[PDB]
Amino acid sequence: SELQYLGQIQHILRCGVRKDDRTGTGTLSVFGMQARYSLRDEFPLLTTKRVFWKGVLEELLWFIKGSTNAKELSSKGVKIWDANGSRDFLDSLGFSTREEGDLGPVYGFQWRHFGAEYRDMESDYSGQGVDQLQRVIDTIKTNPDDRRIIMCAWNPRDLPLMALPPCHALCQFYVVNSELSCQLYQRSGDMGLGVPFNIASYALLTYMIAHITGLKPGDFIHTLGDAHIYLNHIEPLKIQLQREPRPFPKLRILRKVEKIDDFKAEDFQIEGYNPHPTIKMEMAV
C-alpha cells in the first residue's frame, strides 16, 4: 500500500521532467497518476517518515466547521496556514482591504456554503450556499448507489478571491458491500510535503462519514494532476526512499458520534504508529 507512494516518488525522480513553477525553485513533474490505499483495518499514515497527525486531525475539524480563518486553526497549534494568511502574503495578491488571517473562500467555505456571496471570514453563512458535506452524508444514507456523491471545492467564480486555489479540488464517494470508498482529484501535488498530508486527511474524512452512515471504510483512491517534486526536496526524499516501510497504524473512534459537526479531536486514537524519524522538507511559498 505504502509502496505506491514510494513508487510514485521513484517514478518522478527517474522519469520526471524539469519544469518551473509559481514559486522560485523548479520541480520534477509528472502529469496523471493514481494510487489506491486500502482503509480496511488500517489507516494510511506513512511510516517512512513521521507524518504530522495532529495537523491532519485539527485541519479537518477546521474544514468541517467551515472556517476560513487561519488564526482559529493556529490557536489549536497548527501553523500550516499562517504563512498563506500573513499581512505580507495577503498584501502581495492585492487583498490589502482584507484583515490578517482571512484566507478567503477556501475549502471550509466551499464545503458548507457553496455559491454564497463571500463577505469576510467573520460573517455568518448558515442557511446560505449549498451544504455539500451534509448533502453527501444524506445521499449515502438514503441512496448509496447514487453516482453523483461529489464534494467540489473548485469554484471558478471565487477563484480571484482565494489566497491559494484548492489543490484537492474534487472528491467523490462510493458505496458497495457496505463499504465506503473515496476518490480525490488533486490538481497539484507537492509529493514531498503536502501529498502525505492529503492522503491521511481524506482517509480520516472517510472514517468520519463511515462512522456516521454506519459503513466500513473501503478504499481511498488518490488521483493526481501535476505531481511534482520540488528541487529542495530531492535530497530528503532520497533518504526516505532508503527506509524500510513498517505496517500501517490503526485509527479508533472512542465514542459513538451521530452528527459530523459533533466530532472532537479527543474522539480519535492512533494505535501502533511506529514511524521513522521526521524528515524536514521546506515549504515553497
Place this chain on the structure above:
Amino acid sequence: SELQYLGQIQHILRCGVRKDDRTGTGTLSVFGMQARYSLRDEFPLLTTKRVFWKGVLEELLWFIKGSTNAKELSSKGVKIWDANGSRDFLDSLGFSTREEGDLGPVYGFQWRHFGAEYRDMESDYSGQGVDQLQRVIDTIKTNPDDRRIIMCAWNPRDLPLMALPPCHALCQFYVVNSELSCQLYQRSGDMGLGVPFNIASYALLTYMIAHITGLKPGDFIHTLGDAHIYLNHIEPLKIQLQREPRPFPKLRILRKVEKIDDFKAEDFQIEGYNPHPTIKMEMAV
C-alpha cells in the same frame, strides 16, 4: 493504447460487483480507474467497434458554442441528446414549465458562462459568468507552467436545474516540452456506450487547443469514478473483446484557425480509420 480500454472492460467483467443504479438494469461496477492515451501522431478512435465520429465532432462544436439546446445539435444530425430533452423526460424531473429541448445549465453553459443565473435556453449570456474555455486557452499561451488550468462543469448550485448532471465534470490541462496534455475526471462512465465517445471527445478538444496555442498533442489521461457495465451491454462487450485491435487513425486539421469559436466541422479529416463493424449497445434512460 487501446488495450487499456479493453483491459478495463476485462477487469470489470471479472472483478466487477453487482450494483443497482438510477435506471432499471443493474451494472457491474468498479470505483477508481485511470488510463493514458497517447495523442502523438495518432487519434484514439476505437477500432474494435466503429465509434460515432460525426457525433463527437458536432457535439464538441455544440459544446464550444455554449448551446444548451438539444434541438440545435439534432438539426445537425446528432440525436444523442434528444432523449434527455423530450417532453416526457423533462416533465418527469419536475421541469414542466420548461420548454422542450432545454437541457438546462449543462456543459456548454458551464464552459462559457460559469456562475451566471440560468434563465432559459434561448437567452443571451454574453458578458455573464466565467468563460472557462477561453481562460484556459489564454493561460496556456502566457503561462504554460500554471498548475491551475482547469475547466470545471460541476456546479453544485445549478445541479437541481440540470436534466442530467455532468458526467465528465472536471478536466485539467498540462504543458511540457511543447506538448499539451489533458486529464479528465469522469464521475460516471458507461463503459460500453459513453466512455469510447468521451475518450475521442476530449482527445479532439486537446487537438483543438493544441492547434490554437501552437503546441503538439501529448497525452489524454482518462480518470474514472464509477466505471460500470450495464447488464444489457455484457453480450456486446464480450463480442468486442474477441476482435483484434487495429492501429489508430490520424486527425488532420485542414486550415489555420486562430479562435476556438471559428472551428468548423469541415476543418477536420480522419485518415486511415478502419474499424470493426458497429456493435449496438442500448442506452439506459
